[PDB]
Homo-oligomer: A and B are copies of this chain.
């Protein structure tokens, strides 16, 4: 996606709704936005045969 950065949302549609400034305008954007993990992890050393 584009970030939640810079907007300012619509002119709600008619003639030339802020048609001189601006457009897009800053960032914005498209980061892009990739994620995964670290397979996070735990372990418990104790005495287990007894």
Binding site for B on A (CB under 8 A): 1-3, 6-7, 9-10, 12-16, 19, 24, 30, 32, 38-42, 44-47
Interface CB pairs A-B, < 8 A, 22: A1-B15, A1-B44, A1-B46, A1-B47, A2-B15, A2-B44, A3-B15, A6-B15, A9-B41, A9-B42, A10-B39, A10-B40, A10-B41, A12-B39, A12-B40, A12-B41, A13-B39, A13-B41, A14-B32, A15-B30, A16-B24, A19-B24
Interface majority SS (helix, strand, loop, mixed), chain A: loop
Which single residue of chain B is at the shortest CB-CB distance from A37?
B12
A38 to B38 alpha-carbon distance, docked (Å): 27
